[PDB]
Amino acid sequence: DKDVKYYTLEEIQKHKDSKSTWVILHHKVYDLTKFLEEHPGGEEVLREQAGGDATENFEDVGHSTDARELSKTYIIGELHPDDRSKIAKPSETL
Numbered sequence: 155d156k157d158v159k160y161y162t163l164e165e166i167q168k169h170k171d172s173k174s175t176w177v178i179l180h181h182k183v184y185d186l187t188k189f190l191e192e193h194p195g196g197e198e199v200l201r202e203q204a205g206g207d208a209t210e211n212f213e214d215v216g217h218s219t220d221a222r223e224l225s226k227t228y229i230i231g232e233l234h235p236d237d238r239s240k241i242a243k244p245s246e247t248l
């Protein structure tokens with residue numbers, strides 16, 4: 155479509171509520187906020203893994219190929235490469 159944007163966890167972390175839930179997967183962030191009541195998984199399920207790494211939590215159920223393409227539609231932006239290796243969780247400075 156056009157030059158994508160480099161989204162960061164520090165930011166996404168903000169939108170970690172129903173109002174706006176994000177989820178990183180395959181070095182790529184996607185928006186499913188509107189796909190909350192559309193996901194055959196539930197809502198609290200997405201939230202539980204909002205603004206965080208849900209790769210394993212996603213691949214766990216081996217998302218159907220159609221899902222791998224669905225995301226494309228519900229795309230938002232790309233997650234910084236020097237961010238994914240941050241695994242925002244185990245503190246930053248401490």
Ligand code: HEM
Pocket residue numbers: 177184185186189193194195196199200201202203204208211212215217218219220221224225228
């Ligand atoms: C845009 C994002 C997402 C899309 C498009 C998506 C799509 C799907 C689809 C299509 C299914 C399988 C249907 C089939 O194979 O026929 C599924 C299942 C599942 N998804 Fe997602 N998913 C998304 C995000 C997530 C997230 C963030 C989580 C976890 C937090 C999650 C957890 C699950 C689980 C656990 C299942 C199995 C359903 C069950 O609960 O029985 N999904 N997803």
